[PDB]
Ligand binder design. Structure first.
Ligand SMILES: [Zn+2]
Ligand SMILES: [Zn+2]
Ligand SMILES: [Zn+2]
Ligand SMILES: [Zn+2]
Ligand SMILES: [Zn+2]
Ligand SMILES: [Zn+2]
Lengths: 167, 131, 144, 185, 331, 56, 86, 171, 48
């Protein structure tokens, strides 16, 4: 490491896919191994968070419709989380009310679908998080997609995503 | 209206990097700086005297031809050909029918270009894209 | 017509307003007299110069003089350059008037308070439209 | 002299006029360092071009800035707060923006209606400054040679019959001394 | 009571990197610009805005808050101001270094007088440690009185290899007071020409020196450049550095640093007004010399051969160097 | 070095040369008000969880 | 972690130094005074320093000394395994 | 956006927890000091992944404090906003200055200047709401907001979004 | 308000707090006035 002073840094902006310095595409994990930036859509984040919560509950104990899921999530959260969990409660409620894929089968299908285009993790997460009906809507809501994927492929991918929607 | 943006009057001499873009909605010349400043937040009315047609930043493109009339005609031709697209084999080699079809397509393009029957022509395009 | 920038010491526990405050200078503390809670600690009690903001107002200036080693050329040139200042010229008239007042009072064997009051009166009454055509001798004598 | 002072000083700062000091030895009087004023066309043209570009750029940047949202101001401490900086100071009731130093409601900033005024100013300025642009185009088309005291003396029209100043350039022999900005290509 | 809790991580100082402020860094760091040589307004009730004791620079009173951080006297560390000098001035503590660098580099193009084409200069440049490398380079270069546009090639002395130069004869630089005076030696046909090397000229020459050129001399491209040894923006220390003492609290006393800063501001304003209109070169030179002397005494009031700044009481003015040195100093 | 003599000259030279000080010295740690690496400070005291678990 | 010398090749003295003993006793006394769990039976004691001395005598101080070397490397020595003979 | 990030923290343990079960106290402190917290560098730290395998490094006793500083490496799910990114949320508060949409653990404030001209503020209706010919925006409404600006503090994040662009606003 | 800012560097999440003598702070400020930049860093840049 050499000397360091004021340097010009590219302002963070999703349009240019410049996520900053701590959210680069190429990350290093705690074991020193190289990895790609893990970006999760709303449904994937919901499932991962709930998996971690159930694992935590199992550890401590050892040693459907939107309303029912919301009630179960709230009670499990309060039981298996400590104080100052207002943000986590709001996050769980928002994820449950804004998710489009409920089960691991649907989420895995979405992943195996959207990993074909080879877009940025942020872009694929945006496509899996925002419900778009037309390629123009997707283009306007995700400016970075411009000049990266053709309207034909985008239309087919969006159609399949809408096809495999829950309920 | 020779080498400067009519809105901001940015001369190429003082801005050698200035690049002018065009919008198919009204085909009015405008510089990238004006486009960014006026349409970054969202759609807005065209910044021209006598033009009140809204346009989006994403629709801007680079002018190919130096003649605005020919650019308009060619763009409308592209839009038409994206719908009326047939080959000689489509009529089993019937040159008379193919020629009549080409004449009809040219007449439609002319009508769109000169605004003869905009409503009827657009409805016909919409129907034929379905069929 | 400006930011408050005021600090008021009050005891959070007592809540009494105004509070009874004791300044323990020896212990360097400010303590609530009722409950004993300390409100502020590490209170503070030649490197500078003193001035009277009644006869000179706000005017900070420094002289130039010889040192343990110095060349007369630099002192002379620097004093010459310092003399040719436009902003300081205006107050130099008041300073010269003060000097003449001091000389007159000292030759009159008057107490220090007399000459201080004379200088204050001269400063207060100077730079006004009414006293523009009168001799400086008359002005100084009236002030004295 | 006092009136001439500001004019010469401003023109020298803008580099529309160059200065040249030299020692002159009259045959029957004490020598005196006389000051001559002339125009160095390349430097003057460069200064004019840069200033015109800077003025136009300043107006364009002002237009771009004005196109941005207004902001907020504090009447008491007279502090400006951007929209982003003000969004983090709102009260718990989510009703009004409160200042940090004063804890007082903020007031919306001005410049909302000047959007057209700045564009009008730019439109006026370009039309008024049109001649300079054309002259600069012709100058760029041509090539100009830098002027010097001696070169300018070749076109001299004597001001007075018996002017005390000796309008001659007699450089010292074998003088290797070089002064800043005293040489030309 | 103690100081208020902070959310920033608590760490221990492990390294100290010294350097010189750039004018851009001074302007960026500064929270306010000081343009009035006064301390209080006409009412003597609150500090004048833009004056020496601007409230934005901090507070030295137990009753007032800082207009910048809104913290008390026991928590505000002090915030720096700045004064934009009318003309660049030398740093009193770097005059000798500036003179050595001037003798080492050309005064018309900023290129080292001796390149890697000389064996002695190669040996000098081969020294690892910056201080002794600079000493050797200065010893070799100070005797070169010409830029040597063309130099013999290292393969053989038959042909000459061209190097970037100007062919201008270098001057002999001498230190007269707080000024640098250069003497150019004439040709056969006779006394040498003499003139004062303006601070602006030296600043331009130093700014024309290349990164490698001054890295060889020992200056750091990132933390210390030769151009930064000349002051264009003077930082103004906050009131905590120069507190206003009180004897009976009915009479107000100001620090010697405050007095000197007021003198600097007055001299700068005088020079600006002069050079703005008229002000023949003689008057401009006198004003520039006054400003340089005031800055030099503000940073160090004990300069050999120069007059000392004296207050009305007649005692020498206490400078920052005086505060730092001695058995009773900061260290 | 400035703590002994020629304080201001040494500091100016350090600033000009962009010197880096590693704060390995007692004088540096004294100026910065941190525990110098001398005597009781020449080592770091860390907690032993392996022994904590076995101390009951 | 190339700066951590493995336990099999430690070359420092196996005897606790006076400075190490002083710092260990002071740190343990501070922890005890701040209501830390004591792992040694007390036959009646109120001085944290005396309690720490008892803990050191019985080798019940859960602290490890990280001895530093001039090159930046270090060796970890447990108080239990460090001989107290001074 | 939601990301899985590998983070490191410095936890301080009081001497009162230097018992045979200090690791459990460290894990509890992590769950009480990280979960639900906001950092400018990594966003809102929502959940800690792999709660059974947090990497706890050797602790260092502070010189004078007497506490133990442990370097704890863990993997957590963090929500980091970015300007130019489109999100969906629910309006929680409305006022003349604009409405505040709740997106996960964050709140995006929509200024009036960043709203379409047709939308206007109306305090007559209870609760106060914005009414336009095509749609009405009020509390509990679903709004698609494009983040226009973000200001990140060491322990705070605030964002401003817009709904003027096409295909934004009420969902 | 739990806010930090270093104007000039345009950063708000890279601040550290250190405990030093007020005399040391005064010395550093005096050097800053004298145009010397004592920069305190909490991490090492060169190996022993
Ligand atoms: Zn334009
Ligand atoms: Zn138009
Ligand atoms: Zn009380
Ligand atoms: Zn305010
Ligand atoms: Zn402050
Ligand atoms: Zn040269």
């Amino acid at each position: 490491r050499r000397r360091r002073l004021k340097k010009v840094e590219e302002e963070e902006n999703a349009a240019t896919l410049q996520l900053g310095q701590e959210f680069q595409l190429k990350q290093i994990n705690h074991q020193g191994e190289e990895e790609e930036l893990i970006a999760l859509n709303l449904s994937e984040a919901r499932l991962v968070i709930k998996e971690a919560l159930v694992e935590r509950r199992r550890a401590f104990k050892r040693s459907e419709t939107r309303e029912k899921e919301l009630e179960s999530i709230d009670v499990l959260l309060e039981q298996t989380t400590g104080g100052n969990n207002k943000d986590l409660k709001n996050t769980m409620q928002y994820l449950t009310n804004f998710s489009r894929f409920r089960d691991q089968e649907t989420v895995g299908a979405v992943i195996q679908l959207l990993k074909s285009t080879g877009l940025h993790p942020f872009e694929v997460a945006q496509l899996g998080s925002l419900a778009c009906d037309t390629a123009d809507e997707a283009k306007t809501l995700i400016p970075s997609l411009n000049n990266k994927i053709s309207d034909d492929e985008l239309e087919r991918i969006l159609k399949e995503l809408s096809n495999l929607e829950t309920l | 209206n020779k080498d400067m943006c009519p809105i901001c009057k940015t001369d190429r001499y003082l801005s050698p990097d200035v690049k002018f873009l065009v919008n198919p909605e009204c085909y009015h010349r405008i510089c990238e700086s004006c486009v960014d400043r006026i349409f970054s937040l969202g759609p807005a009315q065209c910044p021209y005297k006598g033009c009140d047609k809204i346009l989006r930043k994403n629709k801007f493109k680079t002018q190919i031809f130096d003649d605005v009339e020919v650019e308009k005609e060619v763009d409308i031709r592209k839009r038409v050909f994206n719908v009326f697209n047939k080959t000689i084999d489509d009529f089993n080699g019937d040159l008379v029918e193919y020629n009549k079809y080409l004449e009809e397509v040219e007449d439609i393009i002319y009508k769109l270009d000169h605004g003869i029957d905009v409503a009827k022509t657009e409805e016909k395009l919409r129907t034929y894209e379905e069929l | 017509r400006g930011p408050n920038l005021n600090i008021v010491l009050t005891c959070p526990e007592c809540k009494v307003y105004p509070p009874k405050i004791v300044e323990r200078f020896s212990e360097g503390d400010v303590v609530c007299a009722l409950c004993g809670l300390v409100l502020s600690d590490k209170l503070v009690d030649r490197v500078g110069e003193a001035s009277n903001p009644l006869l000179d107002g706000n005017n900070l200036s420094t002289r130039i003089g010889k040192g343990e080693t110095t060349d007369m050329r630099f002192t002379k040139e620097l004093n010459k350059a310092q003399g040719k200042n436009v902003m300081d010229k205006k107050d130099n008239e008041v300073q010269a008037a003060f000097a003449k007042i001091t000389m007159l009072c000292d030759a009159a064997e008057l107490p220090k308070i007399v000459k201080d009051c004379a200088k204050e009166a001269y400063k207060l009454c100077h730079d006004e439209k009414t006293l523009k055509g009168k001799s400086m001798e008359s002005i100084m004598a009236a002030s004295i | 002299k006092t009136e001439l002072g500001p004019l010469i000083a401003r023109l020298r700062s803008d580099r529309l006029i160059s200065i040249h000091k030299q020692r002159e030895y009259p045959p029957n009087s004490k020598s005196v360092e006389r000051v001559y004023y002339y125009v160095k066309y390349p430097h003057a043209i460069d200064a004019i071009k840069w200033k015109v570009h800077q003025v136009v750029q300043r107006l364009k940047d002002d237009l771009d800035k004005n196109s941005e949202p207004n902001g907020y101001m504090c009447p008491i401490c007279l502090t400006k707060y951007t929209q982003l900086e003000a969004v983090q100071l709102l009260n718990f009731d989510r009703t009004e923006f409160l200042c940090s130093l004063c804890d007082e409601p903020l007031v919306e900033d001005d410049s909302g209606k000047k959007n057209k005024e700045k564009q009008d100013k730019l439109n006026r300025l370009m039309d008024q400054i049109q001649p300079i642009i054309d002259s600069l185009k012709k100058i760029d088309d041509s090539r100009i040679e830098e002027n010097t005291f001696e070169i300018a003396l070749a076109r001299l029209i004597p001001p007075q019959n018996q002017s005390h100043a000796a309008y001659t350039y007699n450089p010292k022999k074998g003088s290797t001394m070089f002064r800043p900005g005293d040489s030309a290509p | 009571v103690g100081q208020q809790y902070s959310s920033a991580p608590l760490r221990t100082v492990k390294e100290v990197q010294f350097g010189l402020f750039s004018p851009e860094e001074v302007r960026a760091i500064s929270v306010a610009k000081i343009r009035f040589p006064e301390t209080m307004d006409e009412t003597q009730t609150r500090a004048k805005i833009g004056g020496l004791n601007d409230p934005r620079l901090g507070s030295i009173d137990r009753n007032l808050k800082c207009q910048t951080c809104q913290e008390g006297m026991n928590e505000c560390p002090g915030h720096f101001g700045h004064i934009d000098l009318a003309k660049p001035v030398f740093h009193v503590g770097f005059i000798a270094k500036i003179k050595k660098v001037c003798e080492c580099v050309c005064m018309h193009c900023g290129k080292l007088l001796l390149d890697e084409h000389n064996e002695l200069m190669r040996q000098a440049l081969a020294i690892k440690d910056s201080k002794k490398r600079f000493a050797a380079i200065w010893t070799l270069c100070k005797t070169k009185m010409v830029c040597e546009t063309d130099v013999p090639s290292e393969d053989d002395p038959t042909q000459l290899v061209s190097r970037g130069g100007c062919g201008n004869t270098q001057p002999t630089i001498r230190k007269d007071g707080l000024k640098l005076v250069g003497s150019w030696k004439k040709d056969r046909a006779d006394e040498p020409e003499l003139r004062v090397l303006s601070t602006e000229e030296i600043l331009n020459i130093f700014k024309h020196i290349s990164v490698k050129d001054f890295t060889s001399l020992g200056f750091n491209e990132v933390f210390s450049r030769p151009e930064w040894m000349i002051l264009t923006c003077l930082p103004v220390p906050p009131p905590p550095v120069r507190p206003s003492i009180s004897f009976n609290e009915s009479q107000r006393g100001e620090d010697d640093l405050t007095f000197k800063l007021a003198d600097i501001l007055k001299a700068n304003i005088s020079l600006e007004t002069l050079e703005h209109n008229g002000a023949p070169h003689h008057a401009i030179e006198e004003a520039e010399s006054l400003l340089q002397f005031h800055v030099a005494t503000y940073m160090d009031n004990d300069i050999a051969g120069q007059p000392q700044a004296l207050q009305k009481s007649g005692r020498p003015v206490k400078s920052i160097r005086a505060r730092l040195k001695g058995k009773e100093g900061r260290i | 070095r400035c703590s002994f003599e020629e304080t201001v000259e040494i500091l100016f030279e350090a600033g000009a040369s962009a010197e880096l000080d590693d704060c390995r010295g007692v004088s540096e740690n004294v100026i910065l008000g941190q525990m110098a690496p001398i005597g009781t400070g020449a080592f770091d005291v860390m907690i032993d969880e392996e022994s904590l678990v076995k101390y009951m | 972690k190339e700066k951590a010398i493995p336990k099999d090749q430690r070359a420092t003295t196996p005897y606790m130094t006076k400075y190490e003993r002083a710092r260990i006793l002071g740190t343990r006394a501070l922890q005890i005074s701040m209501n830390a769990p004591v792992f040694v039976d007390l036959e009646g004691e109120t001085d944290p320093l005396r309690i720490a001395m008892k803990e050191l005598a019985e080798k019940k101080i859960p602290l490890v000394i990280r001895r530093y070397l001039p090159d930046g490397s270090f060796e970890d020595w447990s108080v239990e395994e460090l001989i107290v003979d001074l | 956006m939601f990301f899985i990030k590998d983070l490191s923290l410095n936890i301080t343990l009081h001497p009162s927890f230097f018992g045979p079960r200090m690791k459990q106290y460290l894990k509890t402190k992590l769950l009480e000091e990280v979960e639900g917290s906001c950092t400018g560098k990594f966003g809102y730290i929502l959940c800690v992944l792999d709660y059974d395998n947090i990497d706890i490094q050797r602790g260092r006793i502070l010189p004078t404090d007497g506490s133990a500083e442990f370097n704890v490496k863990y993997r957590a799910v963090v929500f980091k906003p970015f300007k130019g990114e489109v999100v969906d949320g629910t309006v929680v508060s409305c006022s003349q200055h604009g409405f505040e949409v709740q997106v996960g653990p964050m709140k995006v404030f929509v200024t009036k200047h960043l709203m379409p001209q047709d939308l206007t503020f109306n305090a007559g209706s209870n609760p106060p709401s914005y009414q336009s010919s095509e749609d009405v925006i009020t509390i509990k409404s679903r709004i698609r907001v494009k983040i226009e600006g973000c200001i990140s503090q060491v322990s705070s994040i605030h964002a401003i979004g817009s709904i003027k662009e096409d295909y934004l606003g009420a969902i | 308000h739990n806010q930090f800012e270093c104007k000039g560097c345009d950063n708000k999440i890279d601040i550290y707090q250190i405990h030093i003598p007020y005399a040391a702070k005064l010395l550093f400020q005096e050097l800053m006035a004298m145009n010397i930049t004592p920069r305190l860093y909490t991490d090492r840049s060169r190996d022993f």
